[PDB]
Design a protein around this nucleic acid. Structure first.
Lengths: 79, 96, 107, 94, 96, 79, 108, 92
DNA sequence: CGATGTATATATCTGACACGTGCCTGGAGACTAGGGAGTAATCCCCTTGGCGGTTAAAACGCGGGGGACAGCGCGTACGTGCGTTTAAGCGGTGCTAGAGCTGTCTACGACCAATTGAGCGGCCTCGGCACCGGGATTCTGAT
DNA sequence: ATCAGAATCCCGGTGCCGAGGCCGCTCAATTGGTCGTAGACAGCTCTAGCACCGCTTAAACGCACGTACGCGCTGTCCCCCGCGTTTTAACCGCCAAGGGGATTACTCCCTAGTCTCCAGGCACGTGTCAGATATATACATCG
């Protein structure tokens, strides 16, 4: 039940960065579900890279590669 | 003394677009990633950077979705974003 | 009897020979022509200079003297050609531009 | 364990553009990945433009055509100009 | 005289044109427009007979997709008619 | 002038295929505008391939490659 | 010298293991190619072909026709809730669209 | 000569619906589909080899690429097919 | 008009940036072999050109009622502000799983060659489809 | 409700040009084979990850409350949909002809391969000045 750790304040602040002036009370649980789907679709790839390398430790390059194949290239943690 | 609605939300918007720290807490996310990952493989281990790279991607994705949601909200001539605005945006973007 | 670098021949700062090697080892083709790495180095140097000039001007607007990622975001998101080249990318620590939609600001 | 990086050359170019200004190691890392990304894009489309014509090599022409396909129109002119200026200097110095 | 109600035939047009697979823009005018655009990037071009069909298939598929997105935007706006603002929102959420 | 060779009823027929029941009359010039921006992009890429080949005719493969590069792949014309 | 028995007939496949191995080596993917790559790839390509054609024939049978044509391939790909994900960006010439009217447009 | 996959698609068709023929328009679509998925899988298999500093694409690379590119149930059955093929080929 | 927000000025201090050193492995200078691309000439097909006719479709007008969207009303949903309480962040002690490097050697796949039958281009056809037309049923809606 | 009658449906006949069979045949797959190697395994060892401890106070939480906002009912007028008559250029098809795609045989000058040796830049040691942090306090903004 760690998903409760994405608190409502942590959501509101991200909505503020996105420009949202007024927030409906039903948005949060949908947002959590959306994040859970995104996390699963990234971690499954990361763990597939970890396993092909036979490593037991996940490396940040794996997360970069999971994003890059999925199109959302990240600069800063590698190159 | 009391400020009226929206005036401080405006101060929040201007602040958090000016500021640039990460806004999700580290420890809860760190556990959430382990909980999700162990269903694919037990007894995994994580480099301390991989969690930060995940948190960066998750915050950026959500911020972009809230941008598109807010445009969908002004098109219906509301100012409140609605769950159906998220669903519509996700459908037009083509992920739903 | 003497050695002089190909990049100083070309009048470039970037390394010609490293790009030539990285090409040959990248399998991109079974041959590489002698002029390609010079051209490619010039293109990369041009784009590097174009990014850094805008980042420097953003730094001067803050009166800072050290470039940091926020200044690279302020560069990329403010040139209509750079943004079109670099749309599918997230920059760490970069944040967003201050950009409230006009319907939201008060009457 | 030695790592290659571009961390000399970005500094040299910065000294030419703004000899007063420093750069943080994070932003140097960003620049390093930016260079690796645009490098991989150009090399990819050059290889495609070779195979479509059933050619075997990459010449300056494949780089020039990849540059015109990938970069927007105002960048493309100036880039192609200094690409050919660089090559004329190289082939005349020889 | 006989007269159907407004929209009685509009649905019949939808049912008729979703069932079929023919091209719908006039071939000759479309080819003339293609030759008018191509004259900017070079002069004395020529086109193979299949190239203009490939362009017409691409353009008609693109516009049908934009129209389905426009219709979802219009329905979201609580309307039945599509208007230009619905295109302008659709293209921005798609990132065009 | 040739932009007006895309007639009003052709736009109607395409909107009908995509399920549009009622259309405001301003849409037509906007659609001609959107179509024009689409055509300009694709033809620019096609000519670029044609020139690197030193051809004078545009071939169907030039269009297929341009559309793949733009990310909206077409099946039916070889390749 | 033994009488030849094509590697497809050792794998139990119709797809051409020889050709797919040639194209793996000639395509500049990597500098060495092992014997387990082409058999696996040819098997998966056969599977996906048979998968699409089994759905397309059902639409063709419902059309009461003896021939498969592109309209039927579009009906197959867009109806399967997972093939629509693999080929989501792809568009098929002469294929048309699935019948689709929003419930709000129809009369009471 | 333009080598094509047409004979192999026709053989496969005559094992799922033995009454049915296929037009040249549909055949050209299938011939493009095969080339597309071939290029995608060989692509990711190459990247997986490069990142681990290995020189070689083996059956493990193709398996891992398949689990990355296809949706889950298709990945399961594709792996079951490739495993059965490679096992029976090894037993030969 | 009251009074809280962020901006700006002076000073401390501590460590990230910026410099200096050793040295080794990556690059440059030169000679070599041989094959990927540039060339001159051709063929011929499929592209651009012109013309007739009829007739599908587009164009221009009419009628009008159903849609877009401008207005007043309303009650509740969420922004603001406070006191309680809890656990994320910090400095630290402690270990040891496993990541990363050196050594050995042998399982295997790159590349050659002689061989030959599996797959492509071509002609032919005959029958499935399409084009054609006629009569029955559905459905919209006028009264 | 219902039946006048328009469009969809369904049943039937004609005849053609496309899919499918056989055919020649050649070039890309097969088999037998050596051998350079890099990668599978063995061993080491030292990083940094996980576990545990006490301290801190910033953040999160639950609650009250006030009015700004989304949803609803209502109207109206104007512009689009369905229908009619005209007319124009699309579409079909026949006849011309020649530009430039696509193929070929000769040739060369360009790049990969190889040994070298020496210096560029990458670890490892250093220290100071740019910044964060702290304190101080000014004046801009808002109901």
């Amino acid at each position: 039940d760690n998903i409760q750790g994405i608190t409502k304040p942590a959501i509101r602040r991200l909505a503020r960065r996105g420009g949202v002036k007024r927030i409906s009370g039903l948005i949060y649980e949908e947002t959590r579900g959306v994040l859970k789907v995104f996390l699963e679709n990234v971690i499954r790839d990361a763990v597939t890279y970890t396993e092909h390398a036979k490593r037991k430790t996940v490396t940040a390059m794996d997360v970069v590669y999971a994003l890059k194949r999925q199109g959302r290239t990240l600069y800063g943690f590698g190159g | 003394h009391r400020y009226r609605p929206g005036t401080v939300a405006l101060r929040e918007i201007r602040r958090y677009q000016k500021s640039t720290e990460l806004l999700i807490r580290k420890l809860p996310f760190q556990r959430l990633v382990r909980e999700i990952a162990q269903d694919f493989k037990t007894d995994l281990r994580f480099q301390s950077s991989a969690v930060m790279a995940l948190q960066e991607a998750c915050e950026a994705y959500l911020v972009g979705l809230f941008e598109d949601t807010n445009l969908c909200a002004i098109h219906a001539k509301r100012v409140t974003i609605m769950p159906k605005d998220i669903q519509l945006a996700r459908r037009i973007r083509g992920e739903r | 009897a003497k050695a002089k670098s190909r990049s100083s021949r070309a009048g470039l700062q970037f390394p010609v020979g490293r790009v030539h090697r990285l090409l040959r080892k990248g399998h991109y083709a079974e041959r590489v022509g002698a002029g390609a790495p010079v051209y490619l180095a010039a293109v990369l140097e041009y784009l590097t200079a174009e990014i850094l000039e805008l980042a420097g001007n953003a730094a001067r607007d803050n009166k800072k003297t050290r470039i940091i990622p926020r200044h690279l975001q302020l560069a990329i998101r403010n040139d209509e050609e750079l943004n079109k080249l670099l749309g599918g990318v997230t920059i760490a620590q970069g944040g967003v531009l201050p950009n409230i939609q006009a319907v939201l600001l008060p009457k | 364990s030695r790592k290659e990086s571009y961390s000399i050359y970005v500094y040299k170019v910065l000294k030419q553009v703004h000899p007063d200004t420093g750069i943080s190691s994070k932003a140097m890392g960003i620049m390093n990945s930016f260079v690796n990304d645009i490098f991989e894009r150009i090399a990819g489309e050059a290889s495609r433009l070779a195979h479509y014509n059933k050619r075997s090599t990459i010449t300056s022409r494949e780089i020039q055509t990849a540059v015109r396909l990938l970069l927007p129109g105002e960048l493309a002119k100036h880039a192609v100009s200094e690409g050919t200026k660089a090559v004329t200097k190289y082939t005349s110095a020889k």
